[PDB]
Amino acid sequence: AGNDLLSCLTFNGVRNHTVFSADSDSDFNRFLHLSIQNPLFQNSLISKPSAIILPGSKEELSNTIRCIRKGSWTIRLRSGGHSYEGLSYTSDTPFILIDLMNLNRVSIDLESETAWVESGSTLGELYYAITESSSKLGFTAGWCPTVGTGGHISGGGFGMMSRKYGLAADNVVDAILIDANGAILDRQAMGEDVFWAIRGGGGGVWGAIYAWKIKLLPVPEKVTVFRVTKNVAIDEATSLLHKWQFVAEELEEDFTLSVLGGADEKQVWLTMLGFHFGLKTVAKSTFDLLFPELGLVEEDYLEMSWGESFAYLAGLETVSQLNNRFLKFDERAFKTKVDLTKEPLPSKAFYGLLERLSKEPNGFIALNGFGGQMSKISSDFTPFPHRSGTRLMVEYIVAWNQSEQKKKTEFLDWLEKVYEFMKPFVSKNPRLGYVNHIDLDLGGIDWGNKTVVNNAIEISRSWGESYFLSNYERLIRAKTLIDPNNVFNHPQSIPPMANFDY
Numbered sequence: 001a002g003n004d005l006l007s008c009l010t011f012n013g014v015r016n017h018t019v020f021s022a023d024s025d026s027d028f029n030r031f032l033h034l035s036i037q038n039p040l041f042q043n044s045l046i047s048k049p050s051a052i053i054l055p056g057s058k059e060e061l062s063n064t065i066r067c068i069r070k071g072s073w074t075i076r077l078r079s080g081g082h083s084y085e086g087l088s089y090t091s092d093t094p095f096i097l098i099d100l101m102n103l104n105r106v107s108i109d110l111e112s113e114t115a116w117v118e119s120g121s122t123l124g125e126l127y128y129a130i131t132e133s134s135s136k137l138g139f140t141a142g143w144c145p146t147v148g149t150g151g152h153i154s155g156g157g158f159g160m161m162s163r164k165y166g167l168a169a170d171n172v173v174d175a176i177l178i179d180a181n182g183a184i185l186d187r188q189a190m191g192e193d194v195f196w197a198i199r200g201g202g203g204g205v206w207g208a209i210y211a212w213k214i215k216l217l218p219v220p221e222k223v224t225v226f227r228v229t230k231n232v233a234i235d236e237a238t239s240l241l242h243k244w245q246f247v248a249e250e251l252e253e254d255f256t257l258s259v260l261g262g263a264d265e266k267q268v269w270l271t272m273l274g275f276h277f278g279l280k281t282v283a284k285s286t287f288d289l290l291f292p293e294l295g296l297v298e299e300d301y302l303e304m305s306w307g308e309s310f311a312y313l314a315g316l317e318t319v320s321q322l323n324n325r326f327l328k329f330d331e332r333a334f335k336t337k338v339d340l341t342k343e344p345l346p347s348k349a350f351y352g353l354l355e356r357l358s359k360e361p362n363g364f365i366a367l368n369g370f371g372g373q374m375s376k377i378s379s380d381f382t383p384f385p386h387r388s389g390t391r392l393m394v395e396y397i398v399a400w401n402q403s404e405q406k407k408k409t410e411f412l413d414w415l416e417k418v419y420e421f422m423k424p425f426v427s428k429n430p431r432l433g434y435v436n437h438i439d440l441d442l443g444g445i446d447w448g449n450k451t452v453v454n455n456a457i458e459i460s461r462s463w464g465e466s467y468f469l470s471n472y473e474r475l476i477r478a479k480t481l482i483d484p485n486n487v488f489n490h491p492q493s494i495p496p497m498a499n500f501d502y
């Protein structure tokens, strides 16, 4: 069986594969931990793949899937390995890890201003490729350079330019999807329902994206950014955050103001991240008017290329570092939760948040405003439904290093209580979420459990409608169409509709 798999792979020309090894220093273990981006799922007790396959072409990817199906393995796809819940490299059933790191080719077409992007490519590699080819082109996606396009675009992809250009998935014009039978389908082949579904319906559900075709987007040769940390007390920090929410959502689409926040007793720190599609004169004039309380000075505003701004906002030293997929910025175990809002947050919400942060220096928040282009895109244009009416995205994070692992339970408890505190102020009925911010606290499906599987649609509605709202129904239809046998599944994958043949 394990040798039948390898025999099948060899017969089909797939040669880059390594079977499980207990050797701490084996190539298997080296490849396994190479793209584990959350150390929370890195220890010895976690499930390990029986084999790791590294396909290097669309045919190798197709044949790998075909071979794996002859057996009874669970398929796991890994691009960047940034899954918050480690769903790309863990499974409660014996699984084969298909790692896509060798599928990292980016092809820029300056004549059509589009690009073909193999799904193993990271955002950083994509950004670097774009900046290299042109000074007037960029793309809208997340801020983390080591995030893989495979999972990221599959789940939407929100970033600093989303108020201008929407999500990464909102700018996909074609794609190559490899289905459960190993069929190689482009947009025309897969159909519009499936092409709709893959653009934010969540990774690991529809098949294996081989490559994305994206539209490259206009950017000025110079943009303006700032990254300013305000060190203040809770009263001022609360005033700043309460005003920020209005400034952020209301800003014109050419502007973005986001926040990173934390505390430690009396000391509160708020890192303001600013972006403007233009020069510093207009940028400073805008914030002087709308947010004079930030106390920004001329030297805070930095003019640079789009490429430089994305490296800068990511806290990288240089643009070159975008092209390093194995670069480890923060190597801490973490757990995060997210909220979307529909009504303005009361000042007391920010106050309470800051109070709880002051008691836990390992915790922090990330605040993003929607609006702009996000409110001009229809709720069903792609699976991501949180458009017009959505005000903010609020992220709560707790992170720790190896020397603090004994406080793990305490950290998680703190995060749980933070989330409970925020309940009354955020979206309700249901409490909304974001599939790229996958959260298993919401629950999960054991696909080996008959009674659960029979009621999968209703059960899955808990997280399904949080992620996709009314788009949930259409997603189920697309799923049934493209993966009726449920070859691509995980605790929160869209359920296919059953067949009476049971």
Ligand SMILES: *Cc1cc2c(nc3c(=O)[nH]c(=O)nc-3n2C[C@H](O)[C@H](O)[C@H](O)COP(=O)(O)OP(=O)(O)OC[C@H]2O[C@@H](n3cnc4c(N)ncnc43)[C@H](O)[C@@H]2O)c(*)c1C
Pocket: 037, 076, 077, 078, 079, 080, 081, 082, 083, 084, 086, 087, 088, 089, 100, 119, 120, 141, 142, 143, 144, 146, 147, 148, 149, 150, 151, 152, 154, 155, 156, 157, 158, 159, 202, 203, 204, 205, 207, 208, 209, 210, 436, 437, 490
């Ligand atoms: C670690 C990390 C994540 C971030 C960060 N910043 C983000 C941001 O600024 N905006 C966002 O919208 N999201 C941000 N996130 C979260 C990431 O967007 C998500 O975690 C992405 O889903 C991660 O993608 P990836 O790096 O590829 O993670 P994987 O674990 O490999 O995949 C996730 C999921 O998708 C499936 N999958 C992978 N590859 C494919 C292909 N090619 N085809 C179909 N499905 C695929 C996996 O099986 C898994 O289920 C900042 C940081 C630091």
Ligand SMILES: *[C@@H]1O[C@H](CO)[C@@H](O[C@@H]2O[C@H](CO)[C@@H](O[C@@H]3O[C@H](CO)[C@@H](O)[C@H](O)[C@@H]3O)[C@H](O)[C@H]2NC(C)=O)[C@H](O)[C@H]1NC(C)=O
Pocket: 015, 016, 017, 054, 101, 102
């Ligand atoms: C299967 O895939 C892995 C990962 O891509 C392959 O490992 C890679 O092999 C290449 C050589 O073909 C390595 O290139 C060079 O490595 C040396 C190491 O000292 C370095 O000096 C060079 O600058 C260059 O990096 C590459 O490092 C390596 N990548 C990783 C992540 O290990 C492997 O070759 C493939 N296996 C088979 C059988 O094809």
Ligand SMILES: *[C@@H]1O[C@H](CO)[C@@H](O)[C@H](O)[C@H]1NC(C)=O
Pocket: 446, 449, 450, 451, 452
């Ligand atoms: C199936 O899932 C249900 C609900 O989670 C659980 O109560 C039950 O023990 C499971 N049954 C089996 C056979 O594992």
Ligand SMILES: [Mg+2]
Pocket: 023, 024, 025, 026
């Ligand atoms: Mg050894």
